[PDB]
Design a binder for these strands. Structure first.
Ligand SMILES: [K+]
Ligand SMILES: [K+]
Ligand SMILES: [K+]
Ligand SMILES: [K+]
Ligand SMILES: [K+]
Ligand SMILES: [Mg+2]
Ligand SMILES: [Mg+2]
Ligand SMILES: [Mg+2]
Ligand SMILES: [Mg+2]
Ligand SMILES: [Mg+2]
Ligand SMILES: [Mg+2]
Ligand SMILES: [Mg+2]
Ligand SMILES: [Mg+2]
Ligand SMILES: [Mg+2]
Ligand SMILES: [Mg+2]
Ligand SMILES: [Mg+2]
Ligand SMILES: [Mg+2]
Lengths: 294, 43, 162, 272, 249
RNA sequence: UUACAGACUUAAGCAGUGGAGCAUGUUAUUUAAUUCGAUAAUCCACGACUAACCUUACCAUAUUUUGAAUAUUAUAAUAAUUAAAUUAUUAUAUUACAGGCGUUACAUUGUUGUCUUUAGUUCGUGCUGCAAAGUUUUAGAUUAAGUUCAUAAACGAACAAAACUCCAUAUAUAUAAUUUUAAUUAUAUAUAAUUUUAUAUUAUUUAUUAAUAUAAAGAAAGGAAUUAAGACAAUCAUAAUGAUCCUUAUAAUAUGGGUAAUAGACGUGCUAUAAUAAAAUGAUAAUAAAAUUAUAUAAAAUAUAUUUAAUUAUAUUUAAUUAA
């Protein structure tokens, strides 16, 4: 289409009007333009080519194959910065990727909380605020292979909220011990269980439990007695919220099997007073508690 | 490269290939493996 | 009213326009050569656009037979195993012909396209000038000179004496 | 102005960035021939606020140079950020090559949109030389942007029957041209690249043409009418080119078997 | 599509460091030899010294010699780590560091610019375009030169456990498949935006006899509606993301 | 130590070759030199992109000595700069050196080679075992063969094959004012197949199946490149780095010679040992492709061998073309 100078003079710069006039006097209005399917001369988008883009066009004053300035008339005298910054926002960050501005600020508890929430539906806030994690066993194991000895880091950790909920987790990593602890912490939260506690301080009565080669003898204790038990049992009691306990481990004292045996004993070897009363159809009275009641 | 020290007096260029050779010469002098003094035709 | 896109900008998005040949007087042959076709074709398209505005009827780019050069490099084994790597170079050729144009306009075409040439493209131009049989004012080798000098030197004159 | 950078006296009153740009231009354009000037330093001190550089430092930096800055820094030990993490702010060099390709395309597109149309001012109407007064054709060759020995070559070609020679003189002309005449095409072609310049070679061929025509038109002594034209050279050339000189027999054509255009009402109705 | 667009493929001419064609083969051989020699010379001009203990090594890629009919453009990528004045001040705005002095003799120096010297060696106009790369892992040639020449104290007694770790955290591990599929979706969207534009411009009618020969669909604006420089170019550009890297010592 | 399958190889079949002369490489021997190229007992040291000079690395004789480089310090000749000194260039001289086909019994690195590996590792998660660990069906089916497809408390990613990609082939569009003509072509772009469907037969894991044949549609029938490791070879006269040795000589130049010697031996070729095969002749000229021509390709013609002429060889002359 051929347009009158008035219209074309309201959209295009004066410097380009002469070129438009000459083109409208050399190309007949009835020109049937054909599309080339061998050579693509124009870009894949529409452009009047009246403005120089700061990025998609050559930089004015910069030397290059098609620079029209004389060699003594270039205007780039500083070379410490990139001449043509990226267009638009200034970045090419892929959709769904984040610029790594900050590194080393992650909390492994928050990483465990986010992953478990997505995988199991547990509340992240409870994991990151209510739970305490204590490593119990940290050793290196090795497998003999044809290539050679392959070492691995083994971590056994216990987590708990100090209010009845405790869990045991194990983790392995061939790379570093920190990765093994992360997996163990992850596993421990998934294994969280509630343990009955008498007066939220001790166990119900005494427990004689056999876990593989470990013989566990645990006795309930008076208020203010403290934890007088194997060190492995001490850590578990701390996380679980057991304050008063006495006990002795016989036969095997393997730390790993003491920890698992203890967790199992607290669940499979205890019976609440309420559960005993309902099963037998009898009333069970705590004499010490009644003595100080109204 | 030898013409650069007069074309551009302001800039100080370093020839790493030449510099490497000169260090290897000094090293051999320190080990006693230097080059024999060349005989003079006058002799 | 939307922004008007004039015919000059629109032409860029379509195949280059060609002017009809009226008389058929071939005035120039422009042969372009490159080791790759992509710049060769793009530059050829630009020449057709330059000629159109200059009023030069142009034909082409006619593709001419591609020349293939080959080289075989025997490798270290030469044991009749994968012991001969092959290499090749292809010269791509294009011919653009100009018709019924005055010499001055033809020189403007060559000057402009020379100023805005692409990397790795070569250009040969054959100009054809029709002239009259009789013109006005029209349109010794080094070895021979030395031979005369040598034959005058005494080492040769001393024998030529008759 | 282009020469403003050479006149630091005239920088006073220019905006802060313009003065710095003119200071950078004088250093780049002069290089080792650069000598500190008071006027230049006076203008740079006026930019201590645009850059927030202490007015004292400017003076040292202007007289010391990089060493001065290293002293102001207090040390020369800057962290080695050679393996720093990528901030998705720059493009790979291979992607920068594809952007350069696109910068070139846009450069040519802009020329075709607004620069090529201006060439229409130089259009000249073809002043065709009459085919009868201008029968000779001089071919010149130009290798653009190259020094090539063949650029000197000039070729001259003409149809003998357009030379205005009588019958007897035309025969003598063709006899004396020998291998330079092709009877089949009637073309007399001679080329010369003996001289170093095309103009010299063009004159040389022109002079030979006049000499050949003069001898051919001087039939006072010999006309070489007894001597028949020798075409052996043309025959040898013809044997090296394949001749497809066979056409479909006319008595084999069956025009009655050609498809007959059918009647399409739609096209017949769409035309009215 | 990919090879018919300048933003979606690398021109084969770029596969060669000397981009030239001369009818005179001897002149082509000479130009090729001149490009290797100048490349070696430039490698020797990259090492600069301010003082005995301030040696700045600029890492330069191989040169791209673009030989056109009228000029020769020598394009190269360079990396420089500014270790002398890497501050937050604007003191660099009042002096020319050694790297700026070196870059300004390529074209700007009025008396002894390297371009004029080379213009006589090549007998043609010569321009030099230095292009700065900010990271050393954006060009394979620069990356190899840096390691080879500057990281020797890290791998001369085995590859340091920290050195290797840095060479493995350079880039976040982008998902190539998701990036590859995002690119293909954008192309389909752009391709379907132009087909819809024409289908609409045809169904709306923008000589019946001429309606069987010409293929002109209508105004350029309508055919390319919603296809501008602000959305098409950056989405189709290829080789935009580093997705893999293998280093060896 | 058992069993299984598949290899590479094997022999089988077919078509060529095995001795003679000569060409060429190696060995041995000879030689002033016949430059260099191999030593942990099967065999076996091979450079045909051109060794008269050059090449050249070897021998004889003669000759050169900071040499081809960079720098230092002097001396000059020269041009600028600066008020005669400075700086530039050049030459000469000076001394660190330069140079070295000297050294793998000169240590490492490259390079390329061969060589197995190439559906297997590592990682994430899940699951089993108190645990080291394992991740199970499965010692799956199928193909010439990861070939192709199934399947299991495993699932997925990366990895690489594969896909993909290019070439060829068929077709479409564009380009050529169809005398640069081969339009029966040239070369850009696009499409096509890793073919498809019905039917009968034989097997099957018998079903929505393979092997088969039958019918139909189709131009459709062949190739290329491709991972990372592991174990091993080569001096690369095809690039390095160090150490080590020569420095009036193990460096450099010239003339001539040698690498071309000849008892035996070996490899690889050429021409032959005649009639399913050799030799002549075949001009309106039976029928190609791929290349080459500015450090050129050389037409036709004439002359001589040489005879009517042709043929073959050379000379004379140097047409056209630096090229669809
Ligand atoms: K001889
Ligand atoms: K696992
Ligand atoms: K034809
Ligand atoms: K010899
Ligand atoms: K025979
Ligand atoms: Mg001639
Ligand atoms: Mg003949
Ligand atoms: Mg021919
Ligand atoms: Mg010799
Ligand atoms: Mg000799
Ligand atoms: Mg040495
Ligand atoms: Mg020697
Ligand atoms: Mg377990
Ligand atoms: Mg799996
Ligand atoms: Mg020999
Ligand atoms: Mg024939
Ligand atoms: Mg002849």
């Amino acid at each position: 289409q051929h347009y009158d100078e008035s219209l074309l003079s309201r959209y295009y710069p004066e410097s380009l009007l002469k070129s438009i006039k000459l083109a409208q006097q050399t190309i007949p209005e009835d020109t049937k333009f054909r599309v080339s399917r061998n050579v693509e001369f124009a870009p894949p988008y529409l452009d009047d080519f009246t403005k120089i883009h700061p990025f998609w066009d050559y930089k004015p004053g910069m030397p290059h194959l098609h620079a029209q300035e004389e060699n003594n008339n270039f205007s780039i005298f500083r070379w410490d910065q990139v001449q043509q910054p990226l267009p638009g926002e200034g970045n090419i960050l892929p959709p769904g990727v984040s610029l790594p501005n900050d590194g080393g600020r992650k909390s492994k508890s928050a990483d465990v909380a986010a992953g478990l929430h997505k995988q199991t539906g547990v509340d992240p806030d409870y994991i990151t605020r209510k739970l305490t994690m204590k490593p119990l066993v940290m050793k290196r194991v090795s497998n003999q292979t044809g290539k050679g000895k392959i070492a691995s880091f083994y971590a056994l950790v216990v987590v708990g909220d100090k209010n009845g909920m405790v869990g045991l987790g194990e983790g392995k990593s061939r790379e570093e011990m920190s990765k093994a602890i992360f997996k163990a912490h992850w596993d421990a939260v998934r294994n969280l269980k509630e343990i009955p506690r008498y007066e939220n301080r001790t166990i119900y009565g005494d427990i004689d439990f056999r876990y593989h080669g470990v013989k566990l003898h645990l006795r309930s204790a008076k208020p203010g007695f403290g934890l007088r038990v194997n060190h492995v049992i001490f850590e578990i009691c701390e996380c679980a919220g057991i304050k008063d306990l006495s006990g002795k481990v016989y036969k095997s004292r393997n730390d790993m099997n003491i920890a698992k045996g203890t967790i199992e004993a607290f669940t499979k070897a205890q019976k609440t007073l309420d559960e005993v009363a309902l099963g037998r159809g009898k009333k069970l009275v705590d004499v010490r508690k009644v003595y100080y009641s109204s | 490269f030898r013409h650069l020290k007069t074309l551009y007096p302001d800039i100080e260029f370093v020839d790493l290939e030449e510099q490497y050779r000169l260090s290897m010469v000094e090293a051999k002098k320190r080990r006693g493996k230097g080059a024999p003094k060349k005989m003079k035709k006058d002799a | 009213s939307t922004r008007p896109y004039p015919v000059n900008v629109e032409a860029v998005y379509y195949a280059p326009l060609k002017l009809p040949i009226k008389y058929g007087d071939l005035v120039a042959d422009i042969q372009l050569r490159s080791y790759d076709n992509e710049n060769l074709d793009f530059y050829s398209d630009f020449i057709l656009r330059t000629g159109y505005y200059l009023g030069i009827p142009l034909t082409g780019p006619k593709p001419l037979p591609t020349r293939r050069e080959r080289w075989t490099v025997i490798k270290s084994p030469f044991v009749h195993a994968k012991s001969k790597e092959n290499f090749e170079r292809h010269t791509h050729k294009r011919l653009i012909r100009a018709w019924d144009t005055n010499p001055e306009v033809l020189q403007m075409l060559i000057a402009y396209i020379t100023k805005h040439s692409m990397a790795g493209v070569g250009m040969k131009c054959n100009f054809f000038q029709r002239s009259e049989i009789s013109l006005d004012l029209g349109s010794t080798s080094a070895v021979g000179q030395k031979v005369l000098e040598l034959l005058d030197s005494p080492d040769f004159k001393k024998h030529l004496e008759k | 102005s282009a020469d403003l950078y050479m006149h630091p006296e005239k920088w006073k009153g220019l905006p802060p960035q313009r003065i710095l740009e003119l200071y950078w231009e004088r250093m780049a354009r002069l290089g080792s021939e650069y000598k500190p000037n008071k006027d230049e330093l006076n203008a740079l001190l006026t930019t201590s606020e645009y850059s927030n550089v202490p007015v004292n430092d400017i003076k040292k930096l202007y007289h010391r140079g990089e060493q001065g800055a290293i002293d102001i820094k207090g040390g020369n030990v800057n962290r080695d950020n050679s393996l720093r993490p990528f901030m998705f702010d720059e493009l790979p060099s291979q992607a920068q090559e594809l952007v350069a390709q696109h910068r070139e395309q846009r450069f040519y597109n802009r020329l075709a949109a607004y620069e090529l149309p201006l060439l229409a001012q130089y259009r000249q109407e073809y002043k065709r030389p009459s085919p009868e007064s201008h029968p000779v054709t001089y071919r010149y060759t130009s290798y653009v942007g190259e020094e090539h020995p063949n650029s000197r070559k000039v070729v001259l070609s003409v149809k003998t029957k357009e030379l205005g020679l009588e019958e007897k003189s035309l025969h003598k002309f063709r006899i004396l041209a020998r291998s330079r005449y092709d009877h089949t095409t009637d073309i007399f072609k001679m080329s010369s690249d003996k001289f170093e310049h095309a103009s010299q070679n063009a004159r040389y061929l022109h002079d030979i043409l006049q000499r050949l025509l003069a001898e051919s038109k001087d039939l006072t002594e010999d006309d070489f009418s007894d001597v028949p034209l020798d075409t052996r050279h043309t025959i040898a050339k013809s044997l090296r080119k394949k001749k497809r000189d066979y056409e479909f027999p006319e008595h084999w054509k069956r025009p009655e078997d050609a498809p007959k255009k059918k009647f399409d009402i739609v096209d017949q109705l769409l035309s009215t | 599509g990919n090879i018919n667009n300048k933003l979606q493929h690398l021109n084969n001419m770029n596969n060669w460091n000397t981009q030239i064609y001369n009818y005179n083969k001897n002149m082509e051989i000479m130009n090729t030899m001149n490009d290797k020699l100048i490349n070696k010379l430039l490698y020797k001009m990259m090492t600069l010294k301010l003082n005995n203990m301030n040696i700045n090594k600029i890492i330069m890629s191989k040169t791209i010699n673009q030989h056109s009919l009228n000029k020769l453009n020598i394009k190269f990528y360079y990396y420089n780590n500014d270790i002398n004045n890497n501050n937050n001040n604007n003191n660099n705005n009042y002096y020319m560091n050694m790297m700026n002095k070196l870059m300004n003799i390529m074209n700007n120096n009025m008396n002894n610019n390297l371009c004029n010297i080379l213009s006589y060696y090549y007998k043609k106009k010569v321009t030099i375009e230095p292009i700065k790369l900010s990271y050393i892992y954006l060009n394979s040639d620069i990356f190899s030169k840096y390691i080879s020449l500057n990281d020797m104290d890290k791998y001369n007694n085995g590859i340091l456990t920290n050195y290797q770790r840095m060479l493995n955290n350079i880039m976040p591990k982008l998902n190539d498949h998701n990036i590859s599929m995002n690119y293909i979706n954008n192309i389909n969207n752009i391709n379907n935006n132009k087909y819809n534009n024409m289908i609409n411009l045809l169904n709306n009618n923008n000589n019946n006899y001429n309606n069987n020969n010409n293929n002109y669909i209508g105004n350029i604006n309508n055919i390319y509606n919603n296809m501008t420089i602000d959305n098409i170019p950056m989405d189709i550009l290829m080789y935009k993301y580093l997705v893999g890297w293998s280093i060896k010592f």
